[PDB]
Amino acid sequence: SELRDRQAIFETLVAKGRELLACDRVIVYAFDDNYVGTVVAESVAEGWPQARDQVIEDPCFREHWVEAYRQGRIQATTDIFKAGLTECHLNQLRPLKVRANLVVPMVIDDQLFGLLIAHQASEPRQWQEIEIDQFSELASTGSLVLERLH
Ligand SMILES: *[C@H](c1[nH]c(/C=C2\NC(=O)C(CC)=C2C)c(C)c1CCC(=O)O)c1[nH]c(C[C@H]2NC(=O)C(C)=C2[C@@H](*)C)c(C)c1CCC(=O)O
Ligand SMILES: [Cl-]
Ligand SMILES: [Cl-]
Ligand SMILES: [Cl-]
Ligand SMILES: [Cl-]
Ligand SMILES: [Cl-]
Ligand SMILES: [Mg+2]
Numbered sequence: 001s002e003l004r005d006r007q008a009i010f011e012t013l014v015a016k017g018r019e020l021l022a023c024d025r026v027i028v029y030a031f032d033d034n035y036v037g038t039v040v041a042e043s044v045a046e047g048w049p050q051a052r053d054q055v056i057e058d059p060c061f062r063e064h065w066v067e068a069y070r071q072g073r074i075q076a077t078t079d080i081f082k083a084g085l086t087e088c089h090l091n092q093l094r095p096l097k098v099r100a101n102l103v104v105p106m107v108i109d110d111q112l113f114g115l116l117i118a119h120q121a122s123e124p125r126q127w128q129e130i131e132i133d134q135f136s137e138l139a140s141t142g143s144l145v146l147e148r149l150h
Helices: 002-021 060-070 087-093 129-149
Strands: 025-031 037-044 075-077 100-108 111-120
Touching: 002 025, 002 037, 002 111, 002 129, 037 111, 060 100, 060 111, 100 129, 111 129
Parallel strands: none
Antiparallel strands: 025 037, 025 111, 075 100, 100 111
16 A cells, blocks of 8 residues: 555665664655645664654644745754754654754655655764765656556
């Protein structure tokens, strides 16, 4: 079924993603029609909370960024505590443990399905060009598989 096929692909993407970046967490964050995200798959290193199966409503995507991410926007943040974020934003990440993050889009049938997100949990991390390119290509490849499989 479509549901069973998707999950296996999500698991591949998060496993490969964390291997490529050797970071603390990679997730697939999938949007519903409210642009509320669910963590549908996760690969996480020892000692960190499991973000799997969390529903996280963050209005900034629908209110500002969905079309930009469809067009290939990313977020690369070396230190989330120096990114001028509000407490609301910091509060949603604190249960997970995020000190640096890399967010790339998953676009299927010209719509923003979700985001493929990498975390470093306890130290800043400048994401390098080759890492961003690798991770962006992973998410784009996985998205295109999903787009073509059914
Ligand atoms: C936009 C915004 N949110 C996120 C969210 C995440 N980062 C992650 O690692 C994860 C998975 C755990 C999530 C989810 C990102 C990356 C961005 C930036 C998008 C960009 O510019 O590309 C954002 N959301 C908030 C939350 C805040 N705003 C509200 O209205 C309410 C309510 C909030 C608390 C829930 C903030 C402050 C931003 C940044 C400013 C903006 O884009 O509006
Ligand atoms: Cl969903
Ligand atoms: Cl938009
Ligand atoms: Cl744009
Ligand atoms: Cl482009
Ligand atoms: Cl088909
Ligand atoms: Mg199709």
